[PDB]
Design a protein around this ligand. Structure first.
Ligand SMILES: CCCCCCCCCCCCCCCCCC(=O)OC[C@H](COP(=O)([O-])OCC(O)COP(=O)([O-])OC[C@@H](COC(=O)CCCCCCCCCCCCCCCCC)OC(=O)CCCCCCCCCCCCCCCCC)OC(=O)CCCCCCCCCCCCCCCCC
Ligand SMILES: CCCCCCCCCCCCCCCCCC(=O)OC[C@H](COP(=O)([O-])OCC(O)COP(=O)([O-])OC[C@@H](COC(=O)CCCCCCCCCCCCCCCCC)OC(=O)CCCCCCCCCCCCCCCCC)OC(=O)CCCCCCCCCCCCCCCCC
Ligand SMILES: CCCCCCCCCCCCCCCCCC(=O)OC[C@H](COP(=O)([O-])OCC(O)COP(=O)([O-])OC[C@@H](COC(=O)CCCCCCCCCCCCCCCCC)OC(=O)CCCCCCCCCCCCCCCCC)OC(=O)CCCCCCCCCCCCCCCCC
Ligand SMILES: CCCCCCCCCCCCCCCCCC(=O)O[C@@H](COC(=O)CCCCCCCCCCCCCCC)COP(=O)(O)OCC[N+](C)(C)C
Ligand SMILES: CCCCCCCCCCCCCCCCCC(=O)O[C@@H](COC(=O)CCCCCCCCCCCCCCC)COP(=O)(O)OCC[N+](C)(C)C
Ligand SMILES: CCCCCCCCCCCCCCCCCCCC(=O)O[C@H](COC(=O)CCCCCCCCCCCCCC)COP(=O)(O)OCCN
Ligand SMILES: CCCCCCCCCCCCCCCCCCCC(=O)O[C@H](COC(=O)CCCCCCCCCCCCCC)COP(=O)(O)OCCN
Ligand SMILES: CCCCCCCCCCCCCCCCCCCC(=O)O[C@H](COC(=O)CCCCCCCCCCCCCC)COP(=O)(O)OCCN
Ligand SMILES: CCCCCCCCCCCCCCCCCCCC(=O)O[C@H](COC(=O)CCCCCCCCCCCCCC)COP(=O)(O)OCCN
Lengths: 82, 187, 438, 111, 77, 205, 127, 120
């Protein structure tokens, strides 16, 4: 026997939490189609955007990084309800 | 996957360089560099690590090619081809390790020369944001390549199929090791 | 110079052609031949050539190699300490990795091109990942730490080298160039900041040393930390002196903070290897500060102290390895009665620990005196700060010795004939340097 | 129950099948302790019990930042004194806002 | 394998029992107390720093007063 | 120096100056100057005007993030099953709230930056640090303990990173050429160009 | 008998160890001790730090009373009934140079003020 | 008074108080000659209150005597040298047998001694 790290939580509760990821999985093509379409239009529009200060650009990148939600996060928490 | 992730690129780079198809926007290469590096670090599957490495690098290469550095992109594509050949056509652990190291950019291998050409081009344009992003993203990518090295020699016993069809694979590994000193003039 | 470089290239080459059963004997003979070639290089180095004793080029700026005061001392130290590492390691795989690491390190010291320097020092990156992360006795965490820290620092150094090669047109040390840019200075500095452990970038070192084999730990502490001083003297001070003078209050703050925090952290350590590792981190601060003063007294003092550390730290790591082989423990709490049970191991341990505390008959004393004199030349307070806080090293060393010295033990754990043979060169070298043949 | 493994004459063989335990290097290993081993594990893996609390922030800032601030202030004072002592013009340090460009003294010049 | 956790009671009659235990809780000084003692002891340790600061301030103040008086004497005259 | 007797590096005379010599006989510039739009947006004189010019960026980023999250929710919902609830009513708050929060944070950052620069009267790093700190304070209003310290730091650091590598870096390293003779050292005998190299034409996309 | 005396062995650890167990020094003999005696556990003589401080508070004034008078209340003229040792001019001038000398307190001398300012010299080197 | 003393029954507590007081008489004395009168005085002090039956008064006496014996603890207890707390305790402790000595250590697999790098 050897010293081991203590695992927070009960075994069945952790397994139940892990089981909330086992949900119908959409195909990634649906997301990709929209991202490709809007991305092409976005690239066309970007050429006409006004020149922004580097500081403003960096701040916008920070805000976007903070506000980005990982696909797994929505997947785990999605509920088909009002 | 190997032949269509390398060969097609040369034609596009030639078209861009010769037909003056460059933009002032650096967002797309910066995005590719960061997305690719972070996605390479978070990817469980080894095919995804290799696929996202090409995204990151081709983003950086795109940034370098817009500024007129055609020679460096044509030398990079050739080194990248030789580096990717041995990792993709995996048969021997050693060949795959030398390939991963070359893609990573370790100095004893030809991959170092290829990465060096791009990094050297970046310092000439003198864009600070690109250089900072490049350093951090390269570190993140390096973690993924270390993961690949760990998987082969430090995780579990590895048994692979005996596909003894190393047409140009031995030559590519030799060209990666040996080629650094002849091509040192470029960088 | 040419003989030394040729022997260096032959040592990795020899392994490819050996019988796989004669590997250890051949490797030892090659290491001794490399030491003798280094002695020949010293013989063929005339003091009359004040700037560079010898410069050789093999067709390109990258293949420009040369020896100076710093380079000569570090190269002789590497050649002196490698045989010990060789005998301590068993197995063709281990020998191959160690010989490749040594060849890369020894070629880096004599390199005079920044890009070639980078190519040679960072070649030994995967080999350390594999060595520190070995199957049973290694830790993946330590390997990842050392590898990532090295990659990030060396990449910054590489970016600075690329800018210098673009702007000046050459990156060879022999061509006089000066730069006032702060971004480029920072790029070159960050490598030195990480390689020579300085707070807060010192975390990689202790993990690597603890989970490295004794040959690896001996090589790391003995010479790998010194590679920073070669980069400073050869690739930083000539070009970026203005930035070191501009940032001197910050440099001093970071170096003194490293010395203090490392000393305090050494007090909470229960593992012998971690104690030796944190002692090294504390000792590196004086060397870094002394060189940054850009004075004759400082550069000489820093190199001398580096040699003293490169003679005292391998000894402690060797004794710790011998003890661990005898007992399979590094916990100070389990090790007791070592005075009575190992009078011969204990004598050498006490001698080396006295050396680590910079006592007068040891090289550390002379080196410290010179470094403190250089600091006093800068400011009296600078010297006083370092001198006062040296007591913390005494507290931890005394506590360790006291815990090990006495108690009840039922195991006779003393060194064998092989273990005494391995430390005898280090003991003799320590004594000789201590008496003033620095 | 024990036998001498080592042979000085060089005719050393490992009797792996010997009923009697060889007196090899493993004979002198020290017996570990279940509680000491767990203490060692807890000491090394002390990052698990780290918690960000106001007391922790206070202690860190007061000792680490406080020492760093004191050290910077002392170094700045010593630099100012040396500049006054040497007779050099106020040097352009990194964070100092000085309308002077002086950094490295000219060796040829007499100050 | 592991060492025995059973104690030896051979000398318990001669040298006393081990029943009595330490009362220490094995915890360190309070954060408030530590701040006071660090900011008290460290200045004592750095006595040369304060001596240098004191003398330097006195010198600079004297020099400035000298310059001021010089200016005054050089204006009227 | 590569010796242990004298200090390394060198010293340059402050009295002696070297008259500037042109890099080439004729200088052709392929780098276009800043546009009038860039200068207009960069003008921080009137804080309200500055804020309203620069918020479109924050609004766009918030809209992209909200569209992303809304799409993720929409994709999972099943078309085949009829849903009692209205999907748009569920999804519209996501996008609106994300856009509003992003715009509010960017407005705070731009306003504080302009107000500090006006009050101080100087363009400085501190203005970015105080704008970032205020934005991070607003971000961490109700968050647990570590976040109040971490967000003001990360947000304050971001304008520092932007200033160092977007403004100071290029101006610092403007002189370096790479062709002909090294900027500082023109005495050395290196090939002298009649014209500067033009590696690319001025961009137009 | 100096050698071979019986000793009691410290019992083997049998419970989870405290995090700061490194503060205890145990060599295997029964009476283990703190790293610094008096840091914790029994205090010698049952005297706390507060008791020692109160003692020092009672003692300090009585001890300092002789020194404070001569050093502060007394003056050079009134400290002693005689002047410092008289020396020939050549000897005296050299002796006056020493800051830690005893000839600097000669009030009778016409160089008293300079000598007194010399005695109260510089705190730290000016250069 | 310590916890171990407090748990003790009344009779054992008074016996302990007498014992400790006698030891402290010894510690504070300058010679054996002083001990005898002081020990007789201590005996008389305990004998005087031995017949008290009022529990409250007995508790007061015990508590006061314990406070006196706590304050008057000597800095230097007079302990025999060979016992715990003594100068010669542990000077040269008797070695136990069954010591594990490895004979001819360097000659056990002499050529292959060293550390190996195992890989997958
Ligand atoms: C209606 C359709 C719905 C779509 C809506 C719009 C459709 C698209 C239209 C136009 C699209 C073009 C532009 C959109 C963004 C470009 C990306 C893209 O399109 O790739 C395809 C992408 C999917 O590609 P994929 O390969 O399948 O997915 C790969 C991932 O692994 C995906 O796997 P994952 O999601 O599970 O993993 C995510 C992972 C992926 O990683 C990334 O997202 C990498 C991106 C990092 C930065 C990107 C470059 C930034 C440069 C921007 C350039 C402009 C500014 C110029 C200067 C800035 C200098 C940096 O990141 C994370 O783990 C989450 C953290 C988020 C960023 C991490 C960085 C944190 C730093 C903050 C520090 C604070 C922490 C301190 C405290 C920490 C305590 C220790 O599609 C999208 O995501 C589009 C959604 C649009 C939302 C973007 C939000 C803001 C957009 C602009 C802000 C710029 C930052 C980018 C943030 C996130 C972008 C992904
Ligand atoms: C024997 C003499 C060879 C010496 C010189 C060669 C030139 C004479 C060619 C003579 C043939 C020898 C082949 C050697 C070179 C191949 C070039 C070539 O052939 O065309 C060039 C030549 C004229 O083009 P050019 O000299 O390049 O100059 C044009 C402008 O200057 C514009 O072109 P540019 O691009 O060169 O412009 C200058 C360029 C500056 O460009 C350069 O500096 C080039 C640097 C040279 C690098 C060499 C490596 C390239 C890899 C290709 C390997 C050769 C494969 C051979 C293929 C053809 C086989 C004959 O500046 C730039 O910035 C552009 C970027 C250039 C790319 C960047 C260079 C990096 C390359 C990748 C290196 C990375 C390292 C990877 C691994 C390295 C490990 C050590 O064309 C010809 O003379 C006629 C072509 C005829 C070929 C086949 C026809 C004969 C048979 C007819 C019927 C066939 C069917 C029957 C089959 C019969 C057998 C069964
Ligand atoms: C002319 C008259 C004749 C006189 C002679 C003159 C000729 C001159 C040279 C001729 C000598 C023969 C060359 C040897 C070729 C094969 C060597 C080899 O396979 O290594 C392992 C091999 C041991 O074989 P093994 O024990 O039987 O088992 C290997 C099994 O095949 C697989 O075992 P595994 O799956 O268990 O793998 C475990 C692996 C653990 O996994 C790893 O660690 C993977 C790490 C990736 C690579 C390591 C990155 C760092 C390497 C740094 C380079 C070392 C030198 C440092 C100096 C700095 C240079 C900038 O550990 C190792 O394999 C050994 C660790 C250290 C060796 C790494 C060094 C080899 C680098 C590349 C080898 C060349 C292959 C070319 C292929 C040609 C056609 C296919 O050979 C050795 O004895 C040690 C390496 C000797 C290195 C000398 C090779 C030169 C490379 C230096 C680059 C400089 C440019 C080249 C110019 C050279 C002079 C012109
Ligand atoms: C200056 C040079 C440096 C720059 C680099 C670029 C220039 C290239 C210079 C040298 C190129 C050498 C390329 C090396 C290829 C290695 C040879 C090869 O691949 O042979 C294959 C060939 O396989 C085939 O498919 C053969 C089909 C065609 C055979 C060759 C075609 C020849 C056509 C004519 C080529 C002449 C060029 C025409 C005019 C230039 C055999 O391998 P396998 O049998 O499939 O498996 C090997 C198994 N094992 C090793 C494990 C034992
Ligand atoms: C106010 C300071 C003024 C002068 C400072 C000089 C000495 C200050 C403190 C002296 C500590 C040295 C004593 C020591 O090392 O011995 C300890 C060993 O203790 C330790 O190793 C603990 C570490 C203490 C060393 C430093 C602690 C004090 C540091 C001073 C200020 C702290 C920080 C200030 C700047 C870093 C053993 O304890 P004892 O039980 O008393 O041994 C005596 C033998 N006998 C059993 C018979 C009684
Ligand atoms: C009879 C047999 C005797 C048995 C044992 C005695 C062993 C040798 C005894 C005397 C030999 C002394 C030589 C040892 C090193 C002295 C080096 C030295 O001081 O000369 C320096 C040479 O420059 C250099 O660069 C020299 C580099 C090589 C020196 C060794 C580097 C460390 C190698 C491992 C340490 C072992 C050393 C032994 C320049 O000296 P200077 O210019 O500073 O002025 C001198 C005042 N300081
Ligand atoms: C906060 C304490 C500072 C921490 C550092 C402590 C000690 C480091 C000293 C290293 C010695 C040489 C390095 C030169 C400068 C580095 C840091 C000096 C302090 C500093 O940041 O000064 C800044 C200027 O430096 C710059 O503009 C460059 C800053 C470094 C860039 C950061 C990352 C660069 C990596 C680039 C990789 C290679 C690029 C090569 C092209 C701004 O000071 P100021 O003069 O504006 O005063 C205005 C204040 N009122
Ligand atoms: C969140 C992170 C941080 C939060 C918590 C930070 C709290 C720390 C604040 C106080 C820390 C110590 C105080 C040092 C700075 C005090 C104020 C700085 C301003 C300053 O430079 O004044 C100088 C302070 O004296 C000096 O030159 C230094 C005197 C103190 C140094 C000695 C005290 C301890 C000694 C221990 C060793 C450390 C130094 C070893 C070398 C004297 O003014 P000036 O005449 O220079 O004029 C220069 C124009 N302002
Ligand atoms: C990689 C750099 C990122 C910074 C890392 C710092 C640690 C992160 C913690 C977050 C804290 C936010 C960032 C603060 C860093 C700035 C340093 C503060 C010094 C300061 O306040 O002076 C300013 C100038 O410094 C400056 O703004 C220029 C100093 C450049 C920053 C330090 C450069 C080297 C740091 C790298 C150390 C290790 C790298 C690993 C991260 C004011 O100047 P002013 O002109 O406004 O004067 C005032 C007239 N109103």
């Amino acid at each position: 026997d050897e010293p081991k790290h203590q695992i927070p939580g009960n075994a069945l509760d952790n397994w139940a939490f892990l089981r909330t990821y086992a949900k119908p999985l959409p195909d990634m093509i649906h997301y990709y189609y929209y991202v490709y379409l809007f991305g092409f239009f976005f690239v066309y529009k970007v050429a006409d955007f006004p020149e922004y200060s580097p500081r403003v650009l960096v701040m916008a990148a920070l805000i976007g990084s903070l506000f980005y939600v990982r696909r797994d996060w929505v997947h785990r928490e999605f509920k088909d309800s009002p | 996957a190997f032949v269509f992730s390398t060969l097609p690129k040369l034609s596009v780079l030639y078209l861009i360089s010769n037909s003056n198809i460059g933009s002032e926007c650096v967002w797309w290469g910066l995005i590719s560099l960061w997305l690719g590096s972070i996605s390479q670090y978070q990817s469980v599957f080894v095919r995804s690590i290799l696929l996202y490495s090409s995204v990151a690098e081709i983003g950086l290469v795109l940034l370098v090619l817009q500024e007129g550095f055609s020679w460096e992109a044509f030398s990079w594509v050739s080194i990248y081809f030789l580096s990717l050949s041995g990792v993709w056509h995996a048969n021997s652990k050693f060949v795959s390790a030398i390939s991963v190291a070359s893609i990573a950019g370790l100095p004893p291998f030809l991959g170092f020369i290829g990465k060096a050409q791009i990094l050297k081009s970046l310092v000439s344009i003198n864009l600070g944001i690109l250089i900072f992003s490049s350093i951090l993203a390269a570190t993140i990518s390096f973690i993924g390549y270390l993961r690949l090295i760990r998987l082969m020699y430090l995780v579990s016993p590895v048994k692979w199929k005996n596909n003894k069809d190393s047409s140009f694979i031995n030559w590519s590994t030799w060209m990666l090791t040996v080629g650094t000193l002849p091509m040192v003039y470029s960088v | 110079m040419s003989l030394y470089l040729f022997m260096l290239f032959l040592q990795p080459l020899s392994l490819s052609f050996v019988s796989r059963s004669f590997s250890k004997i051949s490797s030892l003979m090659m290491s001794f031949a490399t030491l003798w070639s280094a002695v020949y290089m010293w013989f063929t180095s005339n003091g009359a050539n004040q700037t560079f004793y010898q410069v050789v080029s093999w067709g390109s700026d990258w293949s420009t190699f040369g020896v100076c005061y710093t380079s000569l001392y570090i190269s002789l130290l590497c050649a002196f300490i490698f045989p010990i590492c060789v005998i301590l390691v068993q197995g063709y795989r281990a020998l191959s990795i160690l010989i490749c690491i040594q060849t890369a390190v020894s070629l880096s010291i004599v390199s005079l091109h920044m890009l070639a320097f980078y190519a040679l020092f960072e070649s030994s990156l995967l080999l350390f990942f594999i060595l520190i992360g070995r199957r049973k006795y290694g830790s993946l965490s330590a390997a990842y730490n050392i590898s990532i820290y090295t990659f990030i620092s060396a990449l910054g150094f590489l970016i600075s080298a690329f800018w210098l090669n673009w702007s000046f047109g050459s990156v060879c040390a022999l061509l006089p160039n000066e730069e006032a840019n702060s971004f480029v200075a920072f790029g070159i500095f960050i490598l030195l900041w990480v390689k020579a452990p300085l707070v807060p970038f010192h975390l990689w070192l202790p993990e690597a040393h603890v989970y490295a084999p004794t040959a690896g730990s001996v090589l790391l502490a003995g010479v790998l930390l010194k590679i920073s001083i070669v980069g400073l003297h050869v690739f930083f001070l000539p070009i970026c002196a203005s930035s070191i003078v501009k940032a001197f209050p910050l440099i001093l703050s970071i170096c003194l903070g490293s010395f203090i925090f490392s000393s305090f952290s050494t007090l909470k350590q229960i593992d012998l290897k971690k104690i030796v590792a944190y002692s090294s981190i504390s000792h590196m601060a004086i060397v870094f500060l002394s060189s940054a003063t850009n004075s004759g007294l400082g550069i000489q003092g820093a190199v001398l102290y580096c040699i003293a550390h490169g003679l005292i730290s391998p000894g402690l790591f060797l004794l710790v390895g011998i003890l661990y082989k005898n007992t399979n423990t590094k916990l100070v709490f389990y090790l007791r009665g070592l005075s009575q049970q190992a009078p011969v191991w204990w004598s050498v341990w006490v001698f080396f620990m006295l050396g680590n505390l910079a006592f007068p008959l040891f090289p550390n004393f002379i080196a410290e005196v010179v470094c403190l004199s250089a600091l006093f030349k800068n400011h009296e307070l600078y010297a006083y700060a370092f001198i006062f806080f040296s007591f913390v090293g005494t507290v931890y060393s005394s506590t360790v010795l006291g815990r090990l010295k006495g108690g009840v033990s039922s195991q006779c754990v003393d060194a064998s004939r092989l273990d005494v043979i391995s430390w005898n060169p280090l003991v003799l070298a320590t004594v000789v340097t201590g008496i003033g043949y620095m | 129950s024990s036998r001498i493994a080592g042979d000085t004459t060089g005719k050393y063989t490992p009797n792996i099948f010997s009923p009697e335990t060889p007196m090899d290097r493993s004979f002198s290993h020290v017996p570990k302790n279940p509680f000491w081993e767990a203490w060692v594990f807890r000491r090394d893996n002390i990052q698990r019990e780290f918690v960000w609390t106001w007391q922790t922030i206070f202690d860190l800032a007061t000792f680490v930042g406080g020492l760093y601030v004191a050290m910077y202030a002392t170094a700045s004072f010593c630099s100012r004194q040396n500049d006054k002592r040497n007779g050099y013009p106020e040097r352009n340090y990194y964070f100092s806002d000085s309308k002077s460009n002086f950094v490295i003294p000219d060796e040829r010049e007499f100050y | 394998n592991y060492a025995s956790l059973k104690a030896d009671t051979s000398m318990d009659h001669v040298f006393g029992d081990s029943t009595n235990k330490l009362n220490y809780d094995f915890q360190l000084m309070s954060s408030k107390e530590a701040f006071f003692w660090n900011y008290t002891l460290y200045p004592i340790v750095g006595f040369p720093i304060f001596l240098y600061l004191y003398q330097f301030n006195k010198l600079e103040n004297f020099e400035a007063e000298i310059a001021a008086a010089k200016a005054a004497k050089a204006a009227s005259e | 120096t590569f010796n242990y007797v004298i200090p390394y590096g060198g010293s340059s005379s402050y009295t002696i100056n070297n008259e500037p010599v042109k890099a080439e006989e004729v200088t052709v510039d392929f780098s276009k100057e800043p546009s009038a739009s860039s200068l207009k947006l960069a003008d921080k004189s009137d804080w309200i005007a500055y804020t309203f010019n620069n918020v479109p960026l924050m609004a766009t980023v918030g809209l992209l993030a909200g569209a992303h999250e809304a799409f993720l929710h929409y994709e999972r919902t099943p078309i085949y099953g009829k849903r009692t609830y209205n999907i748009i009513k569920k999804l519209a708050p996501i996008v609106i709230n994300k856009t509003a929060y992003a715009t509010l944070l960017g407005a705070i950052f731009c306003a504080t930056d302009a107000l500090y620069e006006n009050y101080s009267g100087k363009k400085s790093y501190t203005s970015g640090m105080v704008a970032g700190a205020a934005t991070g304070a607003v971000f961490a209003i109700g968050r647990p303990l570590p976040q109040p310290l971490v967000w003001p730091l990360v947000f304050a650091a971001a304008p520092v990173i932007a200033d160092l590598f977007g403004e100071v870096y290029p101006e610092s390293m403007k002189s370096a050429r790479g062709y002909g003779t090294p900027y500082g050292f023109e005495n050395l005998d290196d090939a002298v160009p009649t014209r500067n190299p033009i590696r690319r034409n001025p961009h137009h996309y | 008998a100096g050698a071979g005396g019986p000793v009691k062995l410290s019992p083997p650890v049998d419970k989870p160890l405290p995090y700061n167990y490194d503060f205890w020094m145990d060599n295997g003999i029964y009476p283990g001790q703190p790293i610094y005696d008096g840091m914790f556990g029994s205090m010698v003589g049952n005297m706390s730090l507060e008791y020692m401080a109160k003692g020092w508070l009672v003692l300090l004034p009585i001890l300092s009373a002789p020194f404070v008078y001569e050093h502060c209340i007394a003056d050079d003229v009134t400290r002693n009934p005689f002047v410092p040792r008289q020396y020939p001019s050549e000897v005296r001038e050299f002796l006056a140079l020493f800051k830690n000398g005893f000839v600097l307190n000669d009030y009778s001398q016409p160089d008293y003020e300079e000598m007194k300012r010399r005695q109260s010299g510089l705190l730290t080197p000016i250069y | 008074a310590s916890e171990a003393v407090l748990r003790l029954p009344h009779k054992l507590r008074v016996m302990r108080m007498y014992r400790t007081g006698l030891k402290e008489i010894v510690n504070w004395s300058y010679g054996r000659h002083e001990f005898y009168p002081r020990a007789n005085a201590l005996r008389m002090e305990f004998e005087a209150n031995k017949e008290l039956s009022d529990r409250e008064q007995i508790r007061k006496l015990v508590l006061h005597g314990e406070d006196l014996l706590a304050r008057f603890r000597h800095w230097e207890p007079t302990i025999r040298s060979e016992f715990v707390g003594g100068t010669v305790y542990g000077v040269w402790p008797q070695h136990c047998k069954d010591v594990k000595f490895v004979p001819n250590p360097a000659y056990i697999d002499e050529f292959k001694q060293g550390d190996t790098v195992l890989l997958y």
